[PDB]
């Protein structure tokens, strides 16, 4: 997250931190995710496509810091890693960029709700907030271009939804952005998601309820003028989510 604020997991209790264990035994942070039901985390296929071996991943819930323990945190393995069969990647754009992780503790248990672990609501079919709506993004991604390590503390920011018409302008993304994607940015280009925030939530109030509207997917640079963050439009993928869970 470029700009924004440091946060804590109690303020983002659906947030899942996804890591990968490497040959040799080191663990690195991969991407964010969102808990949509006790056994299911939703994320982005691009986070896993190059290393689609589920045994290598570790999922934490209730965790506020990248390399320190948070009281109440729960660690999970991935019982089932479901990537979208029609996923593809262009120079900038990622398509059908959505993934499901069925999570399981070593005891076989799913998430147990607490102060720091909660599910996030899915939207209804075809129902997104109007453009101009302020929404929140959360993650452990880069804070500036020169970062070579991800920040130790979880961050959040607030961005505004941008219409498809605006996002497809020639100096934005042209026809590279589709109606299965949502754009969002800071009107002054001062805050944005960035590398490492992928897979994490774009959360909006929709009929007074916190709703998973998007999944961080792609964008040129970070907080770059006329280059919005692009998010998988969760409301278009409900049939896929329903059939695969």
């Amino acid at each position: 997250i470029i700009g924004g604020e440091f946060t804590t997991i109690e303020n983002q209790p659906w947030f899942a931190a996804i890591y990968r264990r490497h040959r040799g035994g080191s663990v690195t942070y991969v991407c964010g995710g969102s808990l949509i039901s006790p056994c299911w985390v939703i994320s982005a296929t691009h986070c896993f496509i190059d290393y689609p071996k589920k045994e290598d991943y570790i999922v934490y819930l209730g965790r506020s810091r990248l390399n320190s323990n948070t009281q109440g945190e729960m660690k999970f393995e991935v019982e089932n890693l479901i990537l979208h069969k029609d996923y593809s990647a262009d120079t900038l754009a990622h398509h059908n960029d959505i993934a499901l992780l069925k999570i399981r503790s070593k005891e076989g248990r799913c998430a147990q709700p607490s102060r720091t672990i909660q599910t996030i609501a899915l939207p209804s079919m075809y129902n997104d907030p109007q453009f101009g709506t302020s929404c929140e993004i959360t993650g452990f991604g880069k804070e500036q271009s020169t970062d070579y390590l991800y920040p130790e503390q979880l961050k959040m920011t607030v961005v505004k939804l941008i219409s498809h018409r605006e996002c497809q302008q020639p100096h934005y993304y042209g026809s590279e952005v589709t109606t299965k994607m949502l754009c969002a940015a800071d009107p002054q280009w001062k805050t944005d998601s960035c590398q490492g925030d992928s897979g994490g939530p774009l959360v909006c109030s929709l009929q007074g309820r916190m709703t998973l509207t998007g999944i961080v997917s792609w964008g040129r640079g970070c907080a770059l003028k006329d280059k919005p963050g692009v998010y998988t439009r969760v409301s278009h993928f409900l049939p896929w989510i329903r059939s695969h869970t």
Partner: peptide
């Protein structure tokens, strides 16, 4: 190869 959102955990990052 590629940098930024979309490129995490890739060999071409």
């Amino acid at each position: 190869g590629x940098l930024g959102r979309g490129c995490e955990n890739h060999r071409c990052l």
